[PDB]
Each structure stands twice: as structure tokens, then as C-alpha cells.
């Protein structure tokens, strides 16, 4: 069940349609902000800009929920059975891409201590290459995992 749900959410993130939609809304925000700066008519322009901002917030919040569910369910599927063990490689890629997004790091902090470390044992070339002393949360999780 957990692998099903995690693969579903992952597939929803890396969706060509959804990425095109996010790119289109981003270019719209950029162009409308450039137009508003050109002016400073202004009232309707600002109102359209604010509506674009609200649409973009909605889209980004949807993507953030998908990311939370993806990471959490990957970690729960690794801790449950041994049928799906290349979920460790996919979780690792997905987590190293989002090392700054504090959402991902909170979910990982919550669920990382229940995975047997034998799932990550063969990924020490990739883990020990990202080690640093930066006092962030990503590093406090990564160093503890390598330890």
C-alpha cells in the first residue's frame, strides 16, 4: 500500500503537464511584475497580479503536499517489508534534490529512524560525498544517518 501511494505521488510531481503549468504561471507572474514595475490602469494591473499570485500559491501548495506524501510513504515502505528496496535509491535522490526545502527535512526527521540501516548500506559513496559541517537540519540528519 505504501509503495503504491509513494509511486503515485512521485509520478504526480514529475508530470510534464504540471511542470508546464507551473512554468506558464511563473512566466505570467514574471511578466506581470515587470509590467507593474514599468508603470510604477495600475489598479486593474495590480488586481490581475494578485490573482496570479493566488493561483501560483495554490499550485505550489499542491506540489508541497505531494512532496510530503511522497517522502513519508517512501520511508514507511522501506521500514515495512523487503519487497521494494530500490525505494532507497529513489528516496535518496528525492531527498538530496530537496535538501533546502525545510518541509522535506521535517518529514525525513520524523520518519528516518525506523528504516533498517541495511537499506542504505550500499549507498555510502553518495551519502559520504554530501557530508558538510553547516549546522543545518539536512546535515544533522545526514551525519546521524552515516554514523
Amino acid at each position: 500500500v505504501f509503495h503504491q501511494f509513494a509511486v503515485f505521488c512521485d509520478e504526480q510531481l514529475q508530470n510534464p503537464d504540471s511542470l508546464e503549468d507551473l512554468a506558464r504561471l511563473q512566466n505570467l507572474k514574471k511578466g506581470k511584475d515587470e509590467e507593474v514595475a514599468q508603470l510604477k490602469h495600475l489598479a486593474k494591473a495590480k488586481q490581475w497580479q494578485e490573482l496570479d499570485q493566488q493561483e501560483l500559491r495554490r499550485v505550489e501548495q499542491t506540489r508541497s503536499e505531494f512532496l510530503k506524501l511522497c517522502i513519508e510513504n517512501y520511508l514507511l515502505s522501506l521500514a515495512a517489508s523487503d519487497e521494494h528496496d530500490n525505494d532507497a535509491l529513489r528516496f535518496m535522490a528525492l531527498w538530496l534534490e530537496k535538501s533546502e526545502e525545510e518541509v522535506a527535512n521535517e518529514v525525513v526527521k520524523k520518519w528516518i529512524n525506523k528504516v533498517p540501516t541495511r537499506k542504505f548500506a550500499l549507498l555510502m559513496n553518495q551519502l559520504s560525498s554530501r557530508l558538510q559541517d553547516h549546522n543545518t537540519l539536512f546535515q544533522k540528519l545526514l551525519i546521524d544517518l552515516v554514523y
Binding site: 488586481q47 490573482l51 493566488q54 493561483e55 495554490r58
Partner: protein
């Protein structure tokens, strides 16, 4: 623009004739002729015995359902909630379409009362709609409002104009 795109659509529909399944069903599009004279004027072929989709649908909606909203009331109600959040827009749209019922099935019961002819013409409508839907998805065709779709009330089959 309209002339070039009409030519492209005609060429692709000609490609459709080379395959057994689409040729067996005569899947294709209906063409018209655009002739640009200058950069500001042209001659367009007036398709013979059609009627615009909106010009059939707006009188029929009040002829068959006299208690529903008008077309203009629905348009205005949807245009007022154009600068609002998506939740309110979808709520207004559901509220409007709960008071607006489709009437297109009558276009065939009132131009073709003979069941043999009625069945053949309704199948022509469905097939030409399917062909132009796929062909206009593949080529990104847009601006498909009611005034660019004509209903041919002799053969049943839709004609798409203004393909620019």
C-alpha cells in the same frame, strides 16, 4: 493565418484516407475556402446550408425549457465571477449549470424525423466531431466557441471555421 491553417488541416485530413479504419468510416474534416485579397480584406466561402451552433442553441434552450436561465443570464453570471478565486468560480459554474439543461438532441429530431435518416445523420455528427476533436488536439487548435462551429442540417456533420 486562417488560409494557411485551413490548408494544413486539409492536408492532414487527406493523410487520414490511407488507413483502413479511418477510410472505412470516412473520417475526415469538412473544408471551406479562404481567399485573402490584401492585408486587410478577403473573400470567405459561406458554407451552404449550415447554421451556427450558438444560433441554434440559444433559442432552443428557451423553447424547450422555459423555466431555465437565459443564455445571456448564464453568460453574465459567469462573467461577474471572473476575478475571484477558483473555488467561487467553480461554485458559480455548478450553480449555473444546474439551471441549464442541454437541448442538442433535438437538432436531429426536428430536422430529420425519419428514423433511418435520423440515425445516419446523428452518426455523421458524432464521427465528424470525433475526427475534428483529435485533429485539433494534435495541432493545438483553439478559439472553439459557438460561432466557429457550424451545423450542416442536410448531412448532420459539423464544420469548423476560423482555424487561425
Amino acid at each position: 493565418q486562417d488560409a494557411i491553417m485551413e490548408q494544413v488541416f486539409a492536408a492532414v485530413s487527406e493523410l487520414l484516407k490511407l488507413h483502413r479504419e479511418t477510410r472505412q468510416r470516412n473520417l475526415g474534416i469538412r473544408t471551406y475556402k479562404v481567399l485573402p485579397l490584401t492585408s486587410s480584406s478577403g473573400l470567405i466561402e459561406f458554407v451552404s446550408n449550415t447554421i451556427p451552433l450558438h444560433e441554434y442553441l440559444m433559442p432552443a434552450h428557451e423553447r424547450y425549457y422555459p423555466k431555465d436561465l437565459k443564455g445571456s443570464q448564464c453568460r453574465k453570471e459567469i462573467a461577474n465571477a471572473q476575478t475571484k478565486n477558483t473555488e467561487t468560480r467553480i461554485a458559480v459554474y455548478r450553480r449555473v449549470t444546474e439551471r441549464f439543461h442541454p437541448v442538442m438532441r433535438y437538432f436531429f429530431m426536428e430536422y430529420f424525423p425519419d428514423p433511418d435518416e435520423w440515425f445516419q445523420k446523428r452518426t455523421n455528427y458524432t464521427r465528424t466531431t470525433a475526427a475534428i476533436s483529435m485533429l485539433g488536439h494534435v495541432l493545438g487548435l483553439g478559439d472553439r466557441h459557438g460561432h466557429n462551429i457550424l451545423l450542416d442540417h442536410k448531412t448532420g456533420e459539423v464544420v469548423h471555421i476560423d482555424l487561425g
